[PDB]
């Protein structure tokens, strides 16, 4: 092929131009996201039962909707919460490849048949199913700056004039709302009420009638009378639109003509739909709006597009409100991608400079500067053709293989300057001999390199979708390079081919080395050992090294997680958030850009006693000190904070895969498999929990990820008593409920928009248990009766957050490995400790733990098949049942040094290293090939020496190595190794390749001809 | 999709069904007609009945099999338990009550009210102390259903 | 329902919720003066209609709870739509045994 | 599918009351296994003869 | 404030237009590139593309 193409020259140019033109055409499709899609599809069903409580919300709703989650395909497991905020959330997780759109339909559809069985008040609130995916593009903020507006005011504007605005833009596949929008509040007053002999029911009953929307007819339309002439719509009663139209609602008419209004019995302001999240930004009231990506749209464009749209509305922002940006996954994705592209165009500059310094010929150093920027540009098209996107993973994906597609340009244009040199032919004639020694030898490295990369695309669930990212890019970049190295690179060597400070130094230095090999080699068995010592060093080196997923990189932001004890309230939570808000803006005025503090949401459930604060920082250029990075600021902060009252306040950096599985720990579900109670199970949990610390050998932080029981106030309506008074259960309940939990009566039209109307007791008549005092309900005989007449209340314990795994009630507990021990061996001990627990209690493994369990560890199992296909592949390249074994002995050479960056740096056995590991095993086998080939070739062809050929090969093969192998290191060493800006993952690739490439070349130059001569001699010997 | 479509047309009809027919829960399925297999459950101890062994199964083993991907349909060979109120018409007449009274009764004394919350939200001035209020609760025993007040 | 007092009451709510549907080219709706609503979604030539119908149906189920209880009583139908009838098979009576 | 059914069942045996056990009356699956392996033997052994 | 757009038949005809510039260029570039290979000469395509 290459021979009949170095004749046909401008044809190779065409091909090269298509690849360029298509590869470049694709650069211009290609979605760009920080990461690709790597968590299994989840569908969260979630709903509200205003003023409920964990139990009531559970036995009334959660059980019901889950009792109905049947006949749905590819469901992996089903977990669910039911907390005392009236909130139920159910999360159905699905198998790896399940189409998220069918999964969501099926759920939703099955849900919509459960609905008739849900309590009326929930049906209206509306249960809602969507596809959960914690990957946010950004969270804009809308703050008022003068003090005109409140949370709710700011919320309303955002959800009124600017939401759909975004929701209708490029990319934006979702818009959420950091606040309410208004609702006709109607805040009863048991006192201005027990007077006019009225309860909230009467109040409810009125609002319904005086704020409905009645149909009438037209005039004619439907069958009219013999030749009518006028036809037009009647417009009967239709909804209130003012607070005053509300206030004006007629509630009571008693003898003497008394005009009892809604105004007279309650405040009738306008406010938030819901009142327990207090989101403020840098101290001021705020109400942002969080946007998720799309499905094939640039995080860059549909971001640069969001800021445009935000500019258009910016004149019309009345009073003093401004848009703020406390979260953008863009400044990160951008610099992380402006590098890589740099790392790439630099490693270019290198293969030109290690091409002068070895070849002088400028026309030479100019051929790979047309070869690589083609294979690169070109593998982009192959990416876009497989759905793949430009992202943090698929990016380093190529970088990590820049060494392999370089060592295909150098290698080719080598032989045409080794052969073309010594007693050599003209260019066209010599290229023909070059590709005959490398021709067959390359279309063998291709297969050999297909394995050791393909078997990576086949891994588990979560991780292994990542691995695929890496696998495909590389096997694509790789195969597409060999494809230039047979089509264009040769046809380029001819018609282009015909050093002051080195020249002679290498002339003798080749010879100093050429002897070193042959020297002591008369023993031969010399380095067969020392190999065994380096093979086992590695094995000791391996087992020792810590395992991990992704370098926990400093991103833009991070967050402090504040959690007050049991019955602590909103306000009391705010003060704790104010110190945080302050400490950051104050003892950190140089790094902290903003503190977005939300009083209400927390990690492991909501409540007035939990908070979260998102701190976004100044741009990394402004944060120069390494003590001005995040694994530094948190540590200072974490401790700085460990001096507060009842208030656990700690800070942490979110993992690099935001929408993915945390730590390298476990996620253990404790399940209830007989009628055994919450109480009965809580014990069991403690049993196991206790039994867990009595083993500090298998880490700490074996924590329950829930909430402990708390006190609750129980009002018990005596039935008998209710009967003898004219007092009806429903009338009792509703009053209690409506006053204290508050009810959603119906809808009304404020300024062109539908909005809810809530009706709930004023704040000051519903704070303390001694406040029931004031609530009177009218008996059907006519008289206002007091609650103490027909109730009797007592305090008691109860869960405010009930859990369930796969139908049965559950308690989730998680914990970490063991500073010493392995993630797997931790699970086993834990399971064992489950075995001893009371009869009727089980355990299940979920999330990352389940994610490991079912995906097992395939590395050995799988790379058996890789290896077996490398021997099998290699035994064909060479015509031999034996020789291949002279190449496979190079696997280990790379591993040490690669591993030996356990020393020089303190890192982990992580994904960005393991592929780095593979790239190294890559060139190491590829040097082992051309050397074992060159050896065999001019020993089968020119019948040269059993050992004499071994020298006239490792010689003829030396320079290429030294060239590329240098070019690689002096281009894998820039900000890749020692960084600071989206670093981590960068440092990660480097060190595995860097050293380990050292030991790969600066150690194979001696060992491979050892490998070759030790083989052969043993096969057919006696 | 075949299933998707059926259900879309279904849901237009739902509001038009009897309330009782909704209350049972209409169902849409996509499965083979024939039984793939039948799992039987016995009690070797002779200690549980027909009525117990069925219920064990339903409350305890069904729901998961049902949710098992590719299990298009599940048939329960018996019934799950239920609070059973075997009215007597002589009695009901003696004390002068229709089954209507009995129902109206069971609806009010077998409930799960959301009360509210002491800690409020829109709180006041400055409040420490916040916890939920707990009203009535579904009975859980033949025994409690008994003590109902007609 | 009147006519504005339906567009903003139902048609807003649906439209508000048809964000981010693969291959959306354009939607166009019209509230009525009888109470009727017709949102139409049009998708990129090519794009799979049955999936399109699905995501649509998926995004709707979120507006749905917010719709007047009387609309929910009706239907809110979601199907793949054409625009022009392919035919009009009509039916008459030959010998006045049948009125219109 | 059966694979999973009997596996789910597995996961809920250790919690049965008293002496309550699973019995497997009518089941079509096994024949299908036994069936194809029979046609595999007489596909192996048939290679032996040839 | 008041703006405009096209739909139905229109929006498809509009977008049938705008695309044509591209359709010829990218069409020719393939033809021109197809010759610089079919006759392994960079020269004679300029002579046909004339």
UniProtKB/Swiss-Prot annotation, chain A:
The chain crosses the membrane at residues 10-28, 337-356, 366-385, 392-413, 439-457, 466-490, 525-541, 858-874, 885-904, 911-929, 959-978, 985-1004. Keywords: Cell inner membrane, Cell membrane, Membrane, Transmembrane, Transmembrane helix, Transport. Residues 29-336, 386-391, 458-465, 542-857, 905-910, 979-984 are periplasmic. It comes from the Bacteria. Induction: Positively regulated by MarA, Rob and SoxS transcriptional regulators (at protein level). GO terms for biological process: alkane transport; bile acid and bile salt transport; enterobactin transport; fatty acid transport; response to antibiotic; response to toxic substance; response to xenobiotic stimulus; xenobiotic detoxification by transmembrane export across the cell outer membrane. GO terms for molecular function: alkane transmembrane transporter activity; bile acid transmembrane transporter activity; efflux transmembrane transporter activity; enterobactin transmembrane transporter activity; identical protein binding; xenobiotic transmembrane transporter activity. Signal peptide: none annotated. InterPro entries: AcrB_DN_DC_subdom (IPR027463), Acrflvin-R (IPR001036), MdtF-like (IPR004764). It holds the Pfam family ACR_tran. AcrA-AcrB-AcrZ-TolC is a drug efflux protein complex with broad substrate specificity that uses the proton motive force to export substrates. (Microbial infection) Involved in contact-dependent growth inhibition (CDI), acts downstream of BamA, the receptor for CDI. Its role in CDI is independent of the AcrA-AcrB-TolC efflux pump complex. This is Multidrug efflux pump subunit AcrB. It comes from Escherichia coli (strain K12). The gene is acrB.
Swiss-Prot record, chain C:
Disruption phenotype: Loss of susceptibility to contact-dependent growth inhibition (CDI); inhibiting cells still contact the target. Induction: Positively regulated by MarA, Rob and SoxS transcriptional regulators (at protein level). It comes from the Bacteria. It is found in: Cell inner membrane. Belongs to the resistance-nodulation-cell division (RND) (TC 2.A.6) family. Homotrimer, with large domains that extend into the periplasm, interacts with AcrA and TolC. AcrA may be required to stably link this protein and TolC. Interacts with AcrZ. Part of the AcrA-AcrB-AcrZ-TolC efflux pump. AcrA-AcrB-AcrZ-TolC is a drug efflux protein complex with broad substrate specificity that uses the proton motive force to export substrates. (Microbial infection) Involved in contact-dependent growth inhibition (CDI), acts downstream of BamA, the receptor for CDI. Its role in CDI is independent of the AcrA-AcrB-TolC efflux pump complex. This is Multidrug efflux pump subunit AcrB. It comes from Escherichia coli (strain K12). The lineage of its organism: Bacteria, Pseudomonadati, Pseudomonadota, Gammaproteobacteria, Enterobacterales. The gene is acrB. The chain holds residues 52 to 151 of 1049 of the full protein.
């Amino acid at each position: 092929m290459p021979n009949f193409f170095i004749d046909r020259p401008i044809f190779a140019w065409v091909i090269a131009i298509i690849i360029m033109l298509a590869g470049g055409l694709a650069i211009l499709k290609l979605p760009v996201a920080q990461y690709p899609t790597i968590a299994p599809p989840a569908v969260t069903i979630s709903a509200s039962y205003p003023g409920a409580d964990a139990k009531t919300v559970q036995d009334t709703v959660t059980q019901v909707i889950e009792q109905n989650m049947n006949g749905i395909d590819n469901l992996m497991y089903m977990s669910s919460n039911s907390d005392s905020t009236g909130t139920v959330q159910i999360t159905l997780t699905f198998e790896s490849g399940t189409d998220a759109d069918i999964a969501q339909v099926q759920v939703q559809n099955k849900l919509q048949l459960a609905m008739p069985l849900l309590p009326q008040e929930v049906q209206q609130q509306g249960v809602s199913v969507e596809k959960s995916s914690s990957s946010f593009l950004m969270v804009v903020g809308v703050i008022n700056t003068d003090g005109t507006m409140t949370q709710e005011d700011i919320s309303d504007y955002v959800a009124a004039n600017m939401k759909d605005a975004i929701s209708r833009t490029s990319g934006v596949g979702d818009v959420q709302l950091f606040g309410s929008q208004y609702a006709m509040r109607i805040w009863m007053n048991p006192n201005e009420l027990n007077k006019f002999q009225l309860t909230p029911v009467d109040v409810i009953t009125a609002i319904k009638a005086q704020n409905a929307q009645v149909a009438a007819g037209q005039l004619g339309g439907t069958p009219p009378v013999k030749g009518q002439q006028l036809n037009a719509s009647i417009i009967a009663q239709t909804r209130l639109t003012s607070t005053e139209e509300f206030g004006k609602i007629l509630l009571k008419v008693n003898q003497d003509g008394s005009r009892v209004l809604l105004r007279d019995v309650a405040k009738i302001e306008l406010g938030g739909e819901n009142y327990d999240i207090i989101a403020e930004f840098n101290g001021q009231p705020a109400s942002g709006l969080g946007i998720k990506l799309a499905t094939g749209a640039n995080a860059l464009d549909t971001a640069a597009a969001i800021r445009a749209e935000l500019a258009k509305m910016e004149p019309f922002f009345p009073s003093g409100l401004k848009i703020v940006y406390p979260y953008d996954t863009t400044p990160f994705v951008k610099i992380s991608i402006h590098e890589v592209v740099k790392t790439l165009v630099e490693a270019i500059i290198l293969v030109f400079l290690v091409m002068y310094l070895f070849l002088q010929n400028f026309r030479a150093t100019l051929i790979p500067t047309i070869a690589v920027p083609v294979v690169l540009l070109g593998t982009f098209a192959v990416l876009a053709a497989f759905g793949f996107s430009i992202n943090t993973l698929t990016m380093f994906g190529m970088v990590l293989a820049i060494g392999l597609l370089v060592d295909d340009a150098i290698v080719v244009v080598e032989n045409v300057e080794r052969v073309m040199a010594e007693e050599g032919l003209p260019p066209k004639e010599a290229t023909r001999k070059s590709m005959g020694q490398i021709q067959g030898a390359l279309v063998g490295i291709a297969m050999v390199l297909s394995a050791v990369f393909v078997p990576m695309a086949f891994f588990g669930g979560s991780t292994g979708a990542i691995y695929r990212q890496f696998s495909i890019t590389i096997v694509s970049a790789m195969a597409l390079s060999v494809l230039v190295a047979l089509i264009l690179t040769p046809a380029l060597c001819a018609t282009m081919l015909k050093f002051g400070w080195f020249n002679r130094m290498f002339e003798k230095s080749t010879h100093h080395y050429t002897d070193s090999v042959g020297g002591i080699l008369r023993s031969t068995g010399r380095y067969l050992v020392l190999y065994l010592i380096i093979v086992v060093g590695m094995a000791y080196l391996f087992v020792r090294l810590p395992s991990s997923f992704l370098p926990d990189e400093d991103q833009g932001v991070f967050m402090t997680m504040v959690q007050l004890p049991a019955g602590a309230t909103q306000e009391r939570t705010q003060k704790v958030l104010n110190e945080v808000t302050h400490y950051y803006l104050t003892k950190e005025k140089n790094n902290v850009e903003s503190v977005f503090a939300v009083n209400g949401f927390g990690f492991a459930g909501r409540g007035q006693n939990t908070g979260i604060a998102f701190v976004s920082l100044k741009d990394w250029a402004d944060r120069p000190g390494e003590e001005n990075k995040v694994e530094a600021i948190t540590m200072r902060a974490t401790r700085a904070f460990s001096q507060i009252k009842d208030a656990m306040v700690f800070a942490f950096n979110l993992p690099a895969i935001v929408e993915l599985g945390t730590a390298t720990g476990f996620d253990f579900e404790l399940i209830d498999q007989a009628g055994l109670g919450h109480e009965k199970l809580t014990q069991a949990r403690n049993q196991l929990l206790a039994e867990a610390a009595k083993h500090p050998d298998m880490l700490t932080s074996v924590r329950p990820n829930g909430l402990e029981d708390t006190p609750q106030f129980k009002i018990d309506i005596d039935q008998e008593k209710a009967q003898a008074l004219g007092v009806s259960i429903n009338d009792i309940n509703t009053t209690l409920g409506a006053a204290w939990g508050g009810s959603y009566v119906n809808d009304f039209i404020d300024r062109g928009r539908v909005k809810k109307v809530y009706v709930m007791s004023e704040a000051k008549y519903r704070m303390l248990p001694d406040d029931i005092g004031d609530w009177y309900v009218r008996a059907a005989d006519g008289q206002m009766v007091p609650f103490s007449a027909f109730s009797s209340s007592r305090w008691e314990y109860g869960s405010p957050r009930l859990e369930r795994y796969n139908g049965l009630p559950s308690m989730e507990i998680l914990g970490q490995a063991a500073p010493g021990k392995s993630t797997g061996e931790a699970m086993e001990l834990m399971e064992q400790l489950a075995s001893k627990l009371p009869t009727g209690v089980g355990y299940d493994w979920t999330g990352m733990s389940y994610q490991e369990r079912l995906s097992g560890n395939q590395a050995p199992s799988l790379y058996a098949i890789s290896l077996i296909v490398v021997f099998l592949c290699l035994a064909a390249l060479y015509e031999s049942w034996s020789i291949p074994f002279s190449v496979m002995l190079v696997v280990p050479l790379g591993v040490i040094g690669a591993l030996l960056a356990a020393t020089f740096r303190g890192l982990t056995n992580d994904v960005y290293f393991q592929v780095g590991l593979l790239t190294t095993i890559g060139l190491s086998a590829k040097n082992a090939i051309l050397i074992v080939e060159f050896a065999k070739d001019l020993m089968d062809k020119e019948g040269k020496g059993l050992i004499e050929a071994t020298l006239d090969a490792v010689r003829m093969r030396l320079r290429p190595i030294l060239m590329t192998s240098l070019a690689f290191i002096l281009g894998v060493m820039p900000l890749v190794i020692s960084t600071g800006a989206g670093s981590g993952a960068q440092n990660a690739v480097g060190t595995g390749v860097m050293g380990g490439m050292v030991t790969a070349t600066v150690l194979a130059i001696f060992f491979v001809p050892v490998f070759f001569v030790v083989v052969r001699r043993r096969f057919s010997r006696k």
